[PDB]
Design an enzyme around this catalytic site. Structure first.
Site, PDB file in Angstrom:
ATOM      1  N   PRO B  22      -0.910  -1.355  -8.096  1.00 32.15           N
ATOM      2  CA  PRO B  22      -0.183  -1.681  -6.857  1.00 32.15           C
ATOM      3  C   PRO B  22       1.017  -2.567  -7.148  1.00 32.15           C
ATOM      4  O   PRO B  22       0.900  -3.563  -7.859  1.00 32.15           O
ATOM      5  CB  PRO B  22      -1.233  -2.412  -6.009  1.00 32.15           C
ATOM      6  CG  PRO B  22      -2.262  -2.916  -7.030  1.00 32.15           C
ATOM      7  CD  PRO B  22      -2.299  -1.843  -8.074  1.00 32.15           C
ATOM      8  N   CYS B  24       4.073  -4.366  -4.902  1.00 29.67           N
ATOM      9  CA  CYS B  24       4.760  -4.567  -3.629  1.00 29.67           C
ATOM     10  C   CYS B  24       6.249  -4.336  -3.801  1.00 29.67           C
ATOM     11  O   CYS B  24       6.842  -4.683  -4.827  1.00 29.67           O
ATOM     12  CB  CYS B  24       4.533  -5.969  -3.053  1.00 29.67           C
ATOM     13  SG  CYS B  24       5.472  -6.245  -1.460  1.00 29.67           S
ATOM     14  N   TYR B 179      -5.238 -15.007  -4.186  1.00 24.29           N
ATOM     15  CA  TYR B 179      -5.224 -14.782  -2.746  1.00 24.29           C
ATOM     16  C   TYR B 179      -6.576 -15.121  -2.119  1.00 24.29           C
ATOM     17  O   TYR B 179      -7.378 -15.826  -2.742  1.00 24.29           O
ATOM     18  CB  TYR B 179      -4.782 -13.355  -2.486  1.00 24.29           C
ATOM     19  CG  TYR B 179      -3.411 -13.151  -3.048  1.00 24.29           C
ATOM     20  CD1 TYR B 179      -2.376 -14.037  -2.743  1.00 24.29           C
ATOM     21  CD2 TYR B 179      -3.148 -12.110  -3.919  1.00 24.29           C
ATOM     22  CE1 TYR B 179      -1.095 -13.861  -3.268  1.00 24.29           C
ATOM     23  CE2 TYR B 179      -1.877 -11.930  -4.461  1.00 24.29           C
ATOM     24  CZ  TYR B 179      -0.856 -12.807  -4.135  1.00 24.29           C
ATOM     25  OH  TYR B 179       0.394 -12.610  -4.683  1.00 24.29           O
ATOM     26  N   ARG B 227      -9.832  -5.459  -7.433  1.00 27.42           N
ATOM     27  CA  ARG B 227      -9.083  -6.164  -8.467  1.00 27.42           C
ATOM     28  C   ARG B 227      -9.515  -7.615  -8.404  1.00 27.42           C
ATOM     29  O   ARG B 227      -9.636  -8.172  -7.303  1.00 27.42           O
ATOM     30  CB  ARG B 227      -7.573  -6.054  -8.263  1.00 27.42           C
ATOM     31  CG  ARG B 227      -6.771  -6.655  -9.405  1.00 27.42           C
ATOM     32  CD  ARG B 227      -5.296  -6.261  -9.334  1.00 27.42           C
ATOM     33  NE  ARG B 227      -4.818  -5.857 -10.651  1.00 27.42           N
ATOM     34  CZ  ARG B 227      -3.562  -5.546 -10.936  1.00 27.42           C
ATOM     35  NH1 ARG B 227      -2.624  -5.607  -9.988  1.00 27.42           N
ATOM     36  NH2 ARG B 227      -3.259  -5.148 -12.172  1.00 27.42           N
ATOM     37  N   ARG B 322       5.487  -1.713 -14.359  1.00 25.68           N
ATOM     38  CA  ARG B 322       6.942  -1.843 -14.442  1.00 25.68           C
ATOM     39  C   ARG B 322       7.596  -0.672 -15.159  1.00 25.68           C
ATOM     40  O   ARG B 322       8.737  -0.320 -14.838  1.00 25.68           O
ATOM     41  CB  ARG B 322       7.320  -3.165 -15.121  1.00 25.68           C
ATOM     42  CG  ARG B 322       7.327  -4.370 -14.169  1.00 25.68           C
ATOM     43  CD  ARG B 322       7.379  -5.682 -14.931  1.00 25.68           C
ATOM     44  NE  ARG B 322       6.199  -5.814 -15.774  1.00 25.68           N
ATOM     45  CZ  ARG B 322       5.937  -6.863 -16.539  1.00 25.68           C
ATOM     46  NH1 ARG B 322       6.783  -7.878 -16.574  1.00 25.68           N
ATOM     47  NH2 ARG B 322       4.842  -6.885 -17.278  1.00 25.68           N
TER      48      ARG B 322
HETATM   49  C1  FMN Z   1       7.313  -5.557  -8.442  1.00 26.61           C
HETATM   50  C2  FMN Z   1       5.877  -5.929  -8.685  1.00 26.61           C
HETATM   51  C3  FMN Z   1       4.997  -5.962  -7.610  1.00 26.61           C
HETATM   52  C4  FMN Z   1       3.640  -6.197  -7.810  1.00 26.61           C
HETATM   53  N1  FMN Z   1       2.807  -6.102  -6.723  1.00 26.61           N
HETATM   54  C5  FMN Z   1       1.533  -6.217  -6.918  1.00 26.61           C
HETATM   55  C6  FMN Z   1       0.664  -5.962  -5.825  1.00 26.61           C
HETATM   56  O1  FMN Z   1       1.013  -5.483  -4.756  1.00 26.61           O
HETATM   57  N2  FMN Z   1      -0.672  -6.142  -6.110  1.00 26.61           N
HETATM   58  C7  FMN Z   1      -1.197  -6.477  -7.339  1.00 26.61           C
HETATM   59  O2  FMN Z   1      -2.409  -6.687  -7.439  1.00 26.61           O
HETATM   60  N3  FMN Z   1      -0.367  -6.631  -8.401  1.00 26.61           N
HETATM   61  C8  FMN Z   1       0.923  -6.507  -8.198  1.00 26.61           C
HETATM   62  N4  FMN Z   1       1.765  -6.579  -9.279  1.00 26.61           N
HETATM   63  C9  FMN Z   1       1.176  -6.588 -10.629  1.00 26.61           C
HETATM   64  C10 FMN Z   1       1.066  -5.170 -11.190  1.00 26.61           C
HETATM   65  O3  FMN Z   1       0.078  -4.412 -10.486  1.00 26.61           O
HETATM   66  C11 FMN Z   1       0.709  -5.137 -12.677  1.00 26.61           C
HETATM   67  O4  FMN Z   1      -0.616  -5.639 -12.867  1.00 26.61           O
HETATM   68  C12 FMN Z   1       1.661  -5.925 -13.578  1.00 26.61           C
HETATM   69  O5  FMN Z   1       3.002  -5.571 -13.241  1.00 26.61           O
HETATM   70  C13 FMN Z   1       1.367  -5.740 -15.055  1.00 26.61           C
HETATM   71  O6  FMN Z   1       1.561  -4.382 -15.476  1.00 26.61           O
HETATM   72  P1  FMN Z   1       2.971  -3.858 -16.145  1.00 26.61           P
HETATM   73  O7  FMN Z   1       3.173  -4.723 -17.392  1.00 26.61           O
HETATM   74  O8  FMN Z   1       2.746  -2.456 -16.619  1.00 26.61           O
HETATM   75  O9  FMN Z   1       4.063  -3.981 -15.127  1.00 26.61           O
HETATM   76  C14 FMN Z   1       3.158  -6.433  -9.106  1.00 26.61           C
HETATM   77  C15 FMN Z   1       4.045  -6.437 -10.178  1.00 26.61           C
HETATM   78  C16 FMN Z   1       5.399  -6.180  -9.983  1.00 26.61           C
HETATM   79  C17 FMN Z   1       6.328  -6.178 -11.166  1.00 26.61           C
HETATM   80  C1  8OZ Z   2       1.610  -8.995  -4.838  1.00 25.39           C
HETATM   81  C2  8OZ Z   2       1.458  -9.451  -6.075  1.00 25.39           C
HETATM   82  C3  8OZ Z   2       0.132  -9.922  -6.592  1.00 25.39           C
HETATM   83  O1  8OZ Z   2      -0.889  -9.255  -6.459  1.00 25.39           O
HETATM   84  O2  8OZ Z   2       0.156 -11.093  -7.196  1.00 25.39           O
HETATM   85  C4  8OZ Z   2       2.610  -9.557  -7.010  1.00 25.39           C
HETATM   86  C5  8OZ Z   2       3.916  -9.603  -6.528  1.00 25.39           C
HETATM   87  C6  8OZ Z   2       4.980  -9.793  -7.396  1.00 25.39           C
HETATM   88  C7  8OZ Z   2       4.758  -9.936  -8.748  1.00 25.39           C
HETATM   89  C8  8OZ Z   2       3.471  -9.878  -9.242  1.00 25.39           C
HETATM   90  C9  8OZ Z   2       2.402  -9.681  -8.384  1.00 25.39           C
END
Ligand code: FMN
Ligand code: 8OZ
Ligand code: FMN
Ligand code: 8OZ
Ligand code: CL
Ligand code: CL
Ligand code: CL
Ligand code: CL
Ligand code: CL
Ligand code: CL
Lengths: 357, 356
Positions: B22, B24, B179, B227, B322
């Site tokens: 996920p 956002c 959270y 999660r 990402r």
């Molecule tokens: C733009 C952005 C938004 C994210 N939003 C969420 C979110 O909605 N919920 C969540 O649990 N993690 C969120 N994350 C964390 C990602 O789910 C993921 O665990 C993290 O980016 C690490 O993986 P990656 O190295 O492949 O990006 C977000 C990360 C990014 C960069």
């Molecule tokens: C919604 C997020 C979360 O689950 O902590 C998030 C948002 C931006 C960057 C990383 C994670």
């Protein structure tokens, strides 16, 4: 980086020199586009390219290459493009469209379903300057066009341009390349007519110059009017064909053409095309310099350094990157990063860019 | 390549082990998604990933992380997800969603507009205890009453029910990243003295009760996941990890089908050792000790790293975030990079035919 230099043409400004060329999707039904095209084009537009030319769109049902090709031969077809335009604009890219008539290469199967002429309740009679088959996997002999056919198809192009304008496109491209109708009128290989539309250079150019002039009348003067045109065939007549093609380009320019997408003719199958990365570069440069027209071209510019080198050598005004945007909708971001452009991630919208710096 | 091996869980089959976690987008308005999300999700789904978990979706307005966050606290919010779900399915991918309540870390600006507590756009937050996160989130939450806890549990249930009716085939409870659920489990943030704080059983209660309540409306044949932050890097890692794995065992006994293993982020005083695939050995230990399938994330955008974690049985699904923002068709890139046969047919035919 010259690749990320804006470009102004008439009243339209592109945010960089990366253009996405027209690439048929074979996903429309009776010419009507749908959710496939919407996400496809909106996604590439968010990738950062400055110009996005929508795929070859038939001006008439028999002008489609395949039964899956987009069409704009009715107002209903035009309205389906409206949300595609808005989505391309909303991404910061410029929406363009290629309007086309496949001539004797029409009535064909999709490339992954035969890629050949249809034998089959889905086929249709094709038209061309003369009743001569392309050959190879397009053995169906077209009907030679009458004078009324020529007047009708020109009017189809005008109607397509008008509909395109009203849908909000800011860039139009006439498909005069690749062995389709316009190309087949210009080439001696395919045009054996003896009336006002065949024989001489003036007669063979006539269909193309008249179609351009008719479109010029409905296409706004402040929006680029361009064409894609095959300037040589690699048929052992390249210096002669190149010289005629450049002269026609000069008449395009006198007739209001703003830019020329320089391609190969593909009028017949008996050819020896020297495919290679950016192999069109030197052809496009000569056309640009001799006809004094801005140009784009394509084939193998998915390597960012090749695109940069083509612009710095002034072989191109825009670089068209096709298959690489199918592989990666955000290829523009990859290229900015690959070329060390500052704040490369801000080639993308903020929801991506913030996290990729 | 194990990355391109299908995966079955309950009645859902994924065509490969690539999951989009996920993420956002900060592009919703009062929780309502729009054309940004529709193309964003349909495009990544066409890229070939087998599972696509939609970003953190608030179960209540005060549960949003930011004002740009998606919400699912009404039927209008749920209906807006229908075309996203359908476009994900139409591409051959599986739609999932993360439903969430940001607790004491909510009411924050978009990351590119301050990334700090919010101004006529802000709101009061709630948490187990009236203790601020700190750092750039200094607003003190309202401590939740028993009536608040009952309300929010029903919000999770209503969100699950809406998610089911929108056609999602995979749900994820957001019990990670500091959270509401995470803050109930952590002693750092949970100082209650009633049935929801103090002992391990009490600190687990909100999470187990929310899961059980969600289980009643979420179909038994569709994966129910969560999660969960299993450590904080706060100098209490072996104790925290052991408790977290114990809770994971109770999740499994309560019907959880898979665990997305993450870091707690409950407080800012931490030393997280970021590095490529650094969660791999944490996820493996959880997988092995709690005997649950797991996924994890952070740095698996290198296709070889994703393959290695699967072959080592550290993960059942690899979450790639990402890299799918940079390249919506990352799955095809991963297939090509790993020498997968007919790699271009990870993409649909209008693309695959031309990339052979
Ligand atoms: C733009 C952005 C938004 C994210 N939003 C969420 C979110 O909605 N919920 C969540 O649990 N993690 C969120 N994350 C964390 C990602 O789910 C993921 O665990 C993290 O980016 C690490 O993986 P990656 O190295 O492949 O990006 C977000 C990360 C990014 C960069
Ligand atoms: C919604 C997020 C979360 O689950 O902590 C998030 C948002 C931006 C960057 C990383 C994670
Ligand atoms: C899937 C596909 C469809 C194409 N459709 C068109 C088309 O509609 N009109 C056109 O003039 N060229 C068409 N082309 C050619 C491309 O516009 C371009 O000239 C060619 O792909 C070379 O550029 P590239 O190497 O960057 O892909 C198509 C190419 C592909 C791969
Ligand atoms: C419509 C095409 C054209 O303009 O020649 C096309 C279609 C598929 C591959 C290349 C080109
Ligand atoms: Cl000729
Ligand atoms: Cl010039
Ligand atoms: Cl990239
Ligand atoms: Cl604890
Ligand atoms: Cl297991
Ligand atoms: Cl690629």
């Amino acid at each position: 980086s010259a690749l990320f230099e804006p470009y102004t043409l008439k009243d339209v400004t592109l945010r960089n020199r990366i253009a996405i060329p027209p690439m048929c999707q074979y996903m429309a039904e009776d010419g009507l586009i749908n959710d496939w095209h919407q996400v496809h084009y909106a996604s590439m537009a968010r990738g950062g390219a400055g110009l996005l030319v929508v795929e070859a769109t038939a001006v008439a049902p028999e002008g489609r290459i395949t039964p899956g090709c987009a069409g704009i031969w009715s107002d209903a077809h035009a309205q389906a493009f409206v949300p595609v335009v808005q989505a391309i604009k909303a991404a910061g890219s410029v929406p363009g469209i290629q309007i086309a008539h496949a001539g004797r290469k029409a009535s064909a199967n999709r490339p992954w379903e035969g890629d050949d002429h249809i034998g089959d309740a889905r086929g249709w009679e094709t038209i061309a300057p003369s009743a001569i088959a392309f050959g190879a996997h397009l053995p169906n002999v077209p009907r030679a066009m009458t004078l009324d056919d020529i007047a009708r198809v020109k009017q189809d192009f005008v109607d397509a341009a008008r509909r395109a304008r009203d849908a909000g496109f800011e860039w139009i491209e006439l498909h005069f390349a690749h062995g389709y109708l316009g190309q087949s009128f210009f080439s001696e290989h395919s045009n054996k007519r003896t009336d006002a539309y065949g024989g001489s250079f003036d007669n063979r150019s006539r269909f193309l110059l008249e179609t351009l002039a008719a479109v010029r009348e409905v296409w706004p003067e402040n929006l680029p009017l361009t064409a894609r045109f095959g300037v040589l065939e690699y048929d052992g007549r390249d210096e002669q064909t190149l010289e005629e093609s450049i002269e026609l380009a000069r008449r395009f320019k006198a007739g209001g053409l703003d830019l020329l997408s320089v391609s190969v003719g593909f009028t017949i199958p008996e050819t020896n095309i020297p495919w290679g990365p950016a192999f069109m570069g030197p052809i496009a440069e000569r056309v640009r310099r001799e006809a004094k027209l801005p140009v784009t071209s394509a084939w193998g510019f998915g390597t960012p350094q090749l695109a940069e080198a083509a612009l710095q050598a002034n072989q191109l005004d825009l670089v068209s990157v096709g298959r690489a945007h199918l592989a990666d909708p955000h290829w523009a971001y990859f290229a900015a990063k690959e070329l060390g452009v500052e704040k490369a991630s801000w080639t993308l919208p903020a929801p991506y860019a913030h996290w990729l710096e």
